[PDB]
Amino acid sequence: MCLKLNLLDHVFANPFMNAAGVLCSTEEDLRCMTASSSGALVSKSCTSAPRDGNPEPRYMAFPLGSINSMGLPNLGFDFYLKYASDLHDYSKKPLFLSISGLSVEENVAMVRRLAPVAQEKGVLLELNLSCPNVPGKPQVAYDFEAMRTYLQQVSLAYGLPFGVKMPPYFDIAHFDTAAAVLNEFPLVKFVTCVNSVGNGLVIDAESESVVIKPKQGFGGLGGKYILPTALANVNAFYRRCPDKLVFGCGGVYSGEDAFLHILAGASMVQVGTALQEEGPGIFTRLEDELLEIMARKGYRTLEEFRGRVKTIE
Amino acid sequence: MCLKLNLLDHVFANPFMNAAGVLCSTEEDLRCMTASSSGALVSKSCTSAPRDGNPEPRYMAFPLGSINSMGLPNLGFDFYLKYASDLHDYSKKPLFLSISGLSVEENVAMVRRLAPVAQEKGVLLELNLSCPNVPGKPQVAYDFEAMRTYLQQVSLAYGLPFGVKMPPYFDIAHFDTAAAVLNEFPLVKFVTCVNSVGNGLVIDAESESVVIKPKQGFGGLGGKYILPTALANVNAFYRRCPDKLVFGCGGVYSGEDAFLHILAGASMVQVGTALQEEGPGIFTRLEDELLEIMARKGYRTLEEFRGRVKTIE
Ligand SMILES: Cc1cc2nc3c(=O)[nH]c(=O)nc-3n(C[C@H](O)[C@H](O)[C@H](O)COP(=O)(O)O)c2cc1C
Numbered sequence: 001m002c003l004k005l006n007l008l009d010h011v012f013a014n015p016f017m018n019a020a021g022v023l024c025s026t027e028e029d030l031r032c033m034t035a036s037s038s039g040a041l042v043s044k045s046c047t048s049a050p051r052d053g054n055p056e057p058r059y060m061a062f063p064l065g066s067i068n069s070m071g072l073p074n075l076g077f078d079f080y081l082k083y084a085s086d087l088h089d090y091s092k093k094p095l096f097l098s099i100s101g102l103s104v105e106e107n108v109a110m111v112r113r114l115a116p117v118a119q120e121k122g123v124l125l126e127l128n129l130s131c132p133n134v135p136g137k138p139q140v141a142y143d144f145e146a147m148r149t150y151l152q153q154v155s156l157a158y159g160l161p162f163g164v165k166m167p168p169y170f171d172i173a174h175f176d177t178a179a180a181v182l183n184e185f186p187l188v189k190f191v192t193c194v195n196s197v198g199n200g201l202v203i204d205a206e207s208e209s210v211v212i213k214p215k216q217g218f219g220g221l222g223g224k225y226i227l228p229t230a231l232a233n234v235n236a237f238y239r240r241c242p243d244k245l246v247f248g249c250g251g252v253y254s255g256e257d258a259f260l261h262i263l264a265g266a267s268m269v270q271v272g273t274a275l276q277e278e279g280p281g282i283f284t285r286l287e288d289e290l291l292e293i294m295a296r297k298g299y300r301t302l303e304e305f306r307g308r309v310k311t312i313e
Numbered sequence: 314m315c316l317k318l319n320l321l322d323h324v325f326a327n328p329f330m331n332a333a334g335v336l337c338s339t340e341e342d343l344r345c346m347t348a349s350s351s352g353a354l355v356s357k358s359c360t361s362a363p364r365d366g367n368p369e370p371r372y373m374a375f376p377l378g379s380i381n382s383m384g385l386p387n388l389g390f391d392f393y394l395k396y397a398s399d400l401h402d403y404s405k406k407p408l409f410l411s412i413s414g415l416s417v418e419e420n421v422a423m424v425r426r427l428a429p430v431a432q433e434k435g436v437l438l439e440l441n442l443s444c445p446n447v448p449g450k451p452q453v454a455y456d457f458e459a460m461r462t463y464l465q466q467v468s469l470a471y472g473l474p475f476g477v478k479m480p481p482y483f484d485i486a487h488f489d490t491a492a493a494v495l496n497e498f499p500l501v502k503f504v505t506c507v508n509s510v511g512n513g514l515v516i517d518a519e520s521e522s523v524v525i526k527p528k529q530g531f532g533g534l535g536g537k538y539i540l541p542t543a544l545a546n547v548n549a550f551y552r553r554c555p556d557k558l559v560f561g562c563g564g565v566y567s568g569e570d571a572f573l574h575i576l577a578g579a580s581m582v583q584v585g586t587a588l589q590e591e592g593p594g595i596f597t598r599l600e601d602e603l604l605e606i607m608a609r610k611g612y613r614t615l616e617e618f619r620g621r622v623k624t625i626e
């Protein structure tokens with residue numbers, strides 16, 4: 001019985017990794033994720049320049065999940081590129097580097113410089129599309145013309161396999177259109193579904209107040225709120241992108257949640273809110289829990305059930 | 314202390330009602346809602362002709378909420394019109410009638426016939442904009458040009474105050490666009506936020522199967538999963554539509570949840586999943602619980618706190 005995966009020319013001890021943004025901002029964070037039982041790690045989505053992010057409180061968690069409007073606080077691309085090129089121990093596990101430029105040109109400038117490091121050290125790029133465009137326009141992955149532009153220019157500038165982090169969609173016509181856009185790009189080898197469910201609002205009944213300060217309390221939702229949304233997105237893209245991998249993200253707190261992701265089509269399984277709340281010891285628990293489900297069902301490897309969710313009649 | 318209120322030229326005993334589609338399809342259901350302690354009731358969204366809906370199982374509930382792909386089973390407009398015209402006891406509470414025609418012409422046809430019954434009896438129209446659209450296109454409320462057409466045509470055809478049932482949005486630019494469309498229509502006097510969160514996917518780990526039959530297991534989510542999404546949509550429209558009322562729907566299981574809807578801006582509070590699960594006795598529990606929170610806080614009226622959610626700094 002084993003959780004090993006071999007994909008994108010790397011080997012992974014198990015499918016678990018952090019979700020971008022959680023336990024991955026500082027060198028300390030990245031060393032901690034490297035020391036953990038996770039099968040891989042992803043660095044915080046970065047911009048060319050360092051960012052302080054939004055005012056606090058900007059993240060809160062609760063029994064059913066979390067809300068955040070962090071505002072992309074990060075140490076800047078030069079720091080993450082240095083961690084990839086000089087500090088990360090690739091004998092421990094593979095590294096993904098996520099970027100989230102504020103314009104197409106900013107993303108192009110970073111992927112041009114990542115390319116040689118990607119080729120020589122094997123760091124893998126995750127482009128965050130679930131992210132700001134021009135203010136007053138929807139985030140980039142909700143604007144399919146901007147998404148196509150971004151992917152064309154990054155493909156040309158990078159020239160190497162990469163993947164994309166996608167927001168959730170809610171309408172079949174959107175699943176169809178988004179998968180079609182992605183399928184125009186052969187260098188997009190994985191698709192991570194999903195980023196946070198956007199612009200939720202948590203209100204505290206005692207204080208009669210929202211719980212985060214930015215954006216009048218509005219922010220992205222993660223955790224138990226979003227598992228069925230996450231599963232739908234994973235499966236929708238799994239069915240529509242037969243030449244790409246899908247990584248699952250959203251609502252994983254247990255090996256059974258990871259099992260459902262994998263049944264939906266997930267290759268790698270990322271952990272955001274639950275990891276923020278529990279800490280990196282979650283990875284040993286998730287592994288043990290998933291292996292237990294596999295033993296009860298007689299499954300020896302992940303491929304025996306990945307994408308094999310049954311439908312009715 | 315009572316929770317009585319006046320809206321849209323009608324008096325309501327309390328702000329609670331069923332959500333369209335729950336306990337309101339048959340004459341029996343409508344009589345049971347009328348006999349309940351709810352403040353109002355809404356009939357099942359209807360088409361011109363009766364529909365059997367999708368194959369079963371088509372609804373499933375779980376501790377965190379529900380998933381459905383009912384396929385609009387309903388008795389047909391003629392039946393709900395007859396109920397509004399001849400069978401509903403208006404001395405007991407107000408009645409809303411929900412229409413969900415498959416095209417703009419179908420909706421125009423039903424509203425021209427509804428108009429004289431609305432004038433004579435005071436039945437209120439709720440137009441469901443989660444209805445079907447043209448080839449390769451999203452639901453109507455996710456196509457702002459189709460939305461504007463629908464609202465232009467219904468407004469012209471009906472000529473009386475009405476409301477609209479909206480799907481959730483997840484992007485601030487979308488809140489801005491959708492609110493601006495609605496604000497073009499002075500006859501749109503209430504906006505109900507929100508319909509189910511579209512195209513989620515629930516998977517049972519034991520059976521490795523989806524739990525509903527239609528659409529490969531994909532369906533709309535309600536209940537606890539959707540509360541912060543519903544609060545966000547309520548508050549976004551409350552802020553952007555100052556000359557309309559907002560009706561809140563999504564994730565109400567308790568008087569505390571209702572309190573949060575009202576703080577966000579809700580005038581009426583609709584109950585879907587929790588009503589399907591608990592039955593019409595829920596309405597006395599909700600009233601008691603809301604009155605108890607008001608008493609502890611020192612609030613004597615709903616107006617004292619409606620829309621008064623506090624932001625940080
Ligand atoms: C505090 C916080 C920061 C985040 N920052 C990023 C980010 O920088 N880049 C990104 O792709 N996703 C970011 N996310 C989204 C997560 O990667 C993930 O998609 C989301 O939280 C859903 O997974 P979960 O339900 O396990 O939380 C962030 C989430 C949280 C909670």
Ligand SMILES: Cc1cc2nc3c(=O)[nH]c(=O)nc-3n(C[C@H](O)[C@H](O)[C@H](O)COP(=O)(O)O)c2cc1C
Nearest residue numbers: 332333334358507508509535536563564584585586
């Ligand atoms: C079984 C079922 C049938 C529904 N049918 C309709 C409908 O006919 N029209 C409509 O506007 N919304 C309909 N809905 C959506 C609800 O009115 C409501 O917007 C949604 O369930 C979210 O509220 P909740 O969290 O209380 O369930 C239906 C929901 C369920 C669960």
Ligand SMILES: O=C(O)c1[nH]c(=O)[nH]c(=O)c1CCc1cc2ccccc2c2ccccc12
Nearest residue numbers: 068069070071072073100130131132195196220
């Ligand atoms: O940093 C975040 O807020 C964030 N949180 C998530 O849940 N997922 C994400 O992908 C991100 C980053 C995307 C992003 C999200 C933002 C949300 C609210 C306000 C600002 C931003 C922002 C600003 C600059 C660059 C990126 C962002």
Ligand SMILES: O=C(O)c1[nH]c(=O)[nH]c(=O)c1CCc1cc2ccccc2c2ccccc12
Nearest residue numbers: 381382383384385386413441443444508509533
């Ligand atoms: O009847 C529903 O499935 C339904 N469920 C909800 O959660 N909200 C709704 O608004 C509806 C009705 C909207 C709707 C929803 C549908 C979902 C799957 C397949 C068909 C329909 C459909 C067909 C004709 C007219 C309306 C529909």
